[PDB]
Curated annotation (Swiss-Prot):
The chain holds residues 3 to 648 of 993 of the full protein. 5' to 3' helicase that unwinds RNA and DNA duplexes in an ATP-dependent reaction. Specific to 5'-phosphorylated single-stranded guanine-rich sequences. May play a role in RNA metabolism, ribosome biogenesis or initiation of translation. May play a role in regulation of transcription. Interacts with tRNA-Tyr. Keywords: Acetylation, Activator, ATP-binding, Cell projection, Charcot-Marie-Tooth disease, Cytoplasm, Disease variant, DNA-binding, Helicase, Hydrolase, Metal-binding, Neurodegeneration, Neuropathy, Nucleotide-binding, Nucleus, Ribonucleoprotein, RNA-binding, Transcription, Transcription regulation, tRNA-binding, Zinc, Zinc-finger. It comes from the Eukaryota. Expressed in all tissues examined. Expressed in the developing and adult human brain, with highest expression in the cerebellum. Moderately expressed in fibroblasts. GO terms for molecular function: 5'-3' DNA helicase activity; 5'-3' RNA helicase activity; ATP binding; ATP hydrolysis activity; ATP-dependent activity, acting on DNA; ATP-dependent activity, acting on RNA; DNA binding; DNA helicase activity. This is DNA-binding protein SMUBP-2. Changing residue 560 to I: In HMNR1; severe reduction of ATPase activity and loss of helicase activity on RNA duplices. It comes from Homo sapiens.
Amino acid sequence: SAAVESFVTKQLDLLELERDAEVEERRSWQENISLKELQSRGVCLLKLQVSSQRTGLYGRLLVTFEPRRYAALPSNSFTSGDIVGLYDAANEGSQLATGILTRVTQKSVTVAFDSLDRENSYRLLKLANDVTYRRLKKALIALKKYHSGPASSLIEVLFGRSAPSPASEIHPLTFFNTCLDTSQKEAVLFALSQKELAIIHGPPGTGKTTTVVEIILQAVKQGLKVLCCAPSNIAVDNLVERLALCKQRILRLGHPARLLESIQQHSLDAVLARSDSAQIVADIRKDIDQVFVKNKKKSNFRNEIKLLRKELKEREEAAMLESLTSANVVLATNTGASADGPLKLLPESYFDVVVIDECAQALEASCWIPLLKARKCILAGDHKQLPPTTVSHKAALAGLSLSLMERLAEEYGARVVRTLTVQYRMHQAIMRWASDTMYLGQLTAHSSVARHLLRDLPGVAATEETGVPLLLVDTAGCGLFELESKGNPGEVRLVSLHIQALVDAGVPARDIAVVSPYNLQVDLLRQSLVHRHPELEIKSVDGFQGREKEAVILSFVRSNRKGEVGFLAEDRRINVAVTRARRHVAVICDSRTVNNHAFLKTLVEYFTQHGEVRTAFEYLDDIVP
């Protein structure tokens, strides 16, 4: 109650810092930045046209927006759950309303609300997510004001006040998944045995989610109820897909970010909509069928929806509690799992185990939403990769960067953590660098990826580039300096030349990824490359978490006189960056600058030991020393 009080007040502060930081952050973008290229960044959509408007789940009015009669949407970072602002072109730039994405396709976008004409011209503006802030702030007060309950023991252990209780005796397991390596079989067994806290640690390519799934299947098999969460939609949807293939009884507190049919089937609205209610849409219709007769001009109408509203509620809450009550696993992003959301309906002490996947990517405040809905939690992910992102760096340092899983791991180590060790992605030479610098040399390469090269690929010819798994082309000391975020047009030309090398040898662009730490380098690189290789992904490290290509090319950007790298000195980002690659990783960088940081120095020292190393002088002829 003390360690709790302080942690909490500390957090509540770190938040308004963030919230204030994010808010002002957006004000500037909305200020000194045109509507036209805000969209260019994928953070506003225009100009849009109403395609449909139907009252949906809860009283909420679901409006669907598509590009005016042209037709797919301009690429964007809109995702289910986002907060969105609605404007009219012919209106006074005044904000008409605020909403929530429920479904974002390549050529449509759906917002829930709580007038609108089928003839344009609407705008859509990504805004701070005040709901998340409001929820986080509350699971935080709810924690500090926690009583005597199932969650009691977990909390002691979590806050050091007590210690991981002795692990129940291991009652032999039959594995649903038959192809599990020994490393995973033990993580599973261990995890079921804890009666408090378990953490499974999954380095790049080791099959974490596969092991999270087995663990979940085993807990359903013991007849336990599981609330399973992650910080991202995408993490949640991958679990949904997996569990679904394993014919499990699940319910995702929607909505999905991935559009796969398999996954759309299992979200709340499509669970309810699968009987036994054709009635509840006859309430929806009934009132969205009267906002029709709304335009007569007018009140006393209000009392009539007030009525249909309260009936929809009572009916919806019932079919909900049912669908909830009969699933063995309820799935939600950490936020979705909130105490106001659908879960309010369940009787406390309903769930036994909370599972949180990609915990190392989630900020601890978010984890305390589901975490106190059960007596036992199971954390999974890799705290040696990217931590939760923030806007207020000064807040991050303050401890917002510190996820639940990471602290508990450094804290408890093997009293609680099991780490997977066999990886199925990288050539041994790529693995070995990450193994040793990040994962204590414990990683091992499954025989199906160890040894694999680009020349092994169908249609790919054998080349000085295709037959090597490691390549460094070094910019020291070729006057290929950075700019004045950061950019480096010298590097941009080297990576295009080496892209051309691979593509010309037969490697399809769709198998390659260009990646850079810096947003402006990405921008610089898209500019020079997209028309040349339309299928080639070009992203920042942070926009490539969890991804994987046969070949990855990296651009370090930092090359200067004062020998500075910066944020480039976040090793986990480099770790993530090197580990996306399967058969081939090329690094374009300035030795002379990069070496002034130890982690980076040993990275390039590695490439020098193993794999090939070239100088820019071999690529560029107009180069002046």
